[PDB]
Design a protein around this ligand. Structure first.
Ligand SMILES: O=c1[nH]cnc2c1ncn2[C@@H]1O[C@H](COP(=O)(O)O)[C@@H](O)[C@H]1O
Ligand SMILES: O=c1[nH]cnc2c1ncn2[C@@H]1O[C@H](COP(=O)(O)O)[C@@H](O)[C@H]1O
Ligand SMILES: O=CN(O)CC(=O)O
Ligand SMILES: O=CN(O)CC(=O)O
Ligand SMILES: [Mg+2]
Ligand SMILES: [Mg+2]
Lengths: 431, 431
């Protein structure tokens, strides 16, 4: 279909960036609809690596107009930093990136608050990325936060900013007993980038409606993953935005009925960065192996990511919440050389019940235990394989089992970081 | 189609309650996906009036299971108050209402904060309903708010509540210099209703997935309206939730690809309660006439609603954002006896440009002027008319013009408050 959504079926870090970059070859637009610079998408072409955070993953393509939709919490500093870096590498960001005037703005005080709140939670800290995502959304929802459209009147913006920072500073100093963020510095740093940022502003929803009517191929790029959803995730150990497919329409302005295909990116095993329930977590040599082999460190914080087995119970919630059309299996090659491989097929509740559904809030995951189906591993190297026939039968089996367990076809398989180490069984734009 | 969404194409108060109640005759479920008790839906059967706020509008039907989805901010007090009232009138709420454990909880401190913030904004006050909606969402998004699922452990809930109220109380007393809300009272009032409330809890997304697979008729009932959207509305003069169709999936957990029909409720003229831009606002005798004839006072606050002409520019944004399938024209009879009737067809921007698109944030609506198309009125009474032929040609024309201007068919026309004073040209469940 024309409008293809690419999102994380687990807890983020499933490999969305690589897949957006890969599939945008025929796209006219790529849209970010939620999150901020907490995301960290890694693209690799001919061995050249690009790590994006706030900038959409279709930026390496001349033919694609990259869009940062209204759902996105925008940090002017993060933007300017990424733009320069990309520009210095020959990518003309200004020329191919558009942005929504509806996007809430992430300023330094948001990082202060984010830092204060995590400190205040002590050992019950969420393990957020320390980018001010949470506080930006709070301000958005309270209806006091600053948006891109406010920068269009530098005079009133200054006034509005003084008010908000006056607000937050009282709390930072008097309640949290932390350093106050200086108004002037924020005003100075922000006014130094306003013209560039305001030049990329576009009416994204109106633009998307027109593209829909023309039949342009559009790609919506998700940040984070399903179980980190603000509503449906393992609350409060979640991100502040709806990472699920409903955030596409709320975060871009495209009508919900215009989603033609939702591709769920599914990593061959599971990972989590930050605190939160995680049934299939592995603390043994296998967990270590998965981390080392999959180079599991957050592209944004460098934090070591918790590893474990693929969880079909959790993934089934993802199928459900997102109305998945197909999956893209990623990092399968990381499983090379394992004697056996395990898929969680059900949960053993603390009361003794065996369930195939997931708890909602973090608390309700307390003593939940994973029930597995152990399958044979494979010694053959799957790395960079571009065709199924190059996959060993054990590997093909693992694939089929995941499909059976979920009822959703694995349409694409990624065998390495590079754009080409991939096999597309079915193209979402053709489906 | 099986899953029909009913929402407000304007600024809320378009007549959604009556339409949900009307169309649920064949429905298995009715779901609220956003808002709280700020909404005020009025049902009228055989002259008997029911005003709902938090309870879904399919509650007068034995065959329909009413659902309050996760997107909804839930006030235990509001619930218990409505339940009793309905129960006393022979409607067994407990038996036909289910609710999400994901729903954030609205407690007294949220109303305190809501009151404090509006006072603090002085004359720039949003004109919120004073129900704590905003603060509940802030807490949700910050990841510190209490949800229905927390009530499942009365011990830890008490602890969690002490923390949050400790948090908010510091600000209420030290920053706002307002009365502190007592922890014990909140704990007492909440613990007095926990068993009833926890008894209605269900896994709504899992339930909705199963209904989808069976082919059950589902109705999603929207609160507020499009231009009050937290993202796309006339920010900051908006409500804190996405009132647009994308909130259906985020607020219920149903996959976005499962919306089969979106019915936009469109009132024959416009109204707004609370502050905010409003191009076609009428401050003349005609505005008065519209208020009196349409009994325009908020079903929740009793506040007089600002009136004006139907705005096709604004309504076109609604079409776009929600992927409208058809409209339901409401209160047409309120226009009876007008010499002439006006439809805004474009905007005259402050710089001189004539535009057919709407500004985003409130500020950008500053000196925008409405450009009209004046059509003949009608002296004939349209009240209670159940068939087109009973409509005068002028009235039929007004209808057709709205369709031409928007490109969306008016599938249902309401001619009075009663469930029957309606003509269904096309049924969303059949479409
Ligand atoms: O893009 C990401 N990938 C994976 N986990 C993430 C990502 N962004 C945030 N998280 C996790 O989401 C939670 C909240 O972080 P926040 O998004 O900084 O507020 C923490 O568990 C983070 O580690
Ligand atoms: O259900 C409603 N109908 C119409 N306007 C509403 C409704 N709920 C809230 N508003 C308006 O939305 C804005 C914010 O109010 P809040 O929803 O109390 O936070 C104010 O303009 C309210 O008057
Ligand atoms: O790619 C994003 N990361 O995994 C988030 C982090 O580093 O915390
Ligand atoms: O039906 C809801 N109202 O119009 C809101 C209010 O009374 O303010
Ligand atoms: Mg990442
Ligand atoms: Mg109402």
């Amino acid at each position: 279909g024309n409008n293809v959504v690419v999102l994380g079926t687990q807890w983020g870090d499933e490999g969305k960036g690589k897949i957006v970059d890969l599939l945008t070859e025929r796209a006219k637009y790529v849209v970010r609809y939620q999150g901020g610079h907490n995301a960290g998408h890694t693209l690799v072409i001919n061995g050249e690596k690009t790590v994006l955070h706030l900038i959409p993953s279709g930026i390496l393509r001349e033919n694609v107009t990259s869009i940062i939709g209204n759902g996105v919490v925008l940090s002017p500093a993060a933007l300017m930093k990424e733009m320069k870096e990309l520009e210095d590498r020959g990518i003309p960001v200004r020329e191919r990136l558009l942005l929504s005037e509806a996007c809430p703005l992430i300023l330094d005080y948001h990082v202060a608050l984010d830092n204060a709140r995590e400190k205040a939670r002590g050992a019950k800290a969420i393990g957020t990325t320390g980018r001010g995502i949470g506080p930006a959304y709070e301000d958005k929802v309270a209806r006091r936060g600053l948006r891109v459209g406010d920068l269009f009147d530098k005079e009133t913006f200054a006034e509005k900013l003084k008010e908000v920072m006056e607000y937050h500073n009282f709390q930072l100093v008097n309640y949290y007993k932390a350093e106050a963020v200086d108004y002037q510095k924020v005003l100075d740093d922000t006014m130094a980038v306003a013209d560039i940022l305001t030049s990329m502003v576009v009416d994204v929803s109106d633009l998307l409606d027109q593209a829909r009517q023309r039949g342009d191929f559009v790609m919506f790029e998700g940040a984070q993953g399903t179980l980190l959803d603000i509503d449906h995730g393992t609350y409060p150990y979640v991100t502040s935005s709806n990472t699920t497919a409903g955030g596409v329409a709320t975060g871009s302005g495209l009508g919900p009925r215009y989603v033609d295909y939702v591709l769920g990116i599914l990593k061959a095993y599971s990972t989590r960065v930050g605190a939160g329930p995680f049934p299939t977590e592995l603390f043994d040599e296998t967990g270590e192996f998965l981390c080392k082999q999959g180079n599991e460190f957050g592209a944004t914080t460098g934090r070591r990511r918790r590893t474990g087995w693929l969880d079909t119970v959790a993934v089934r919630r993802a199928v459900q919440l997102n109305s998945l059309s197909g999956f893209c299996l990623t990092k399968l090659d990381v499983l090379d050389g394992l004697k056996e491989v395990k898929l969680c097929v059900a949960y053993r509740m603390p009361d003794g019940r065996e369930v195939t559904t997931t708890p909602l809030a973090a608390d309700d995951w307390k003593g939940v235990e994973p029930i597995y189906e152990t399958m044979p591993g494979w010694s053959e190297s799957t790395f960079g394989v571009k065709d199924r026939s190059g996959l060993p039968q054990a590997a093909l089996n693992y694939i089929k089992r995941i499909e059976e367990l979920t009822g959703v076809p694995i349409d694409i398989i990624s065998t390495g970081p590079d754009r080409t180490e991939t096999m597309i069984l079915r193209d979402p734009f053709d489906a």
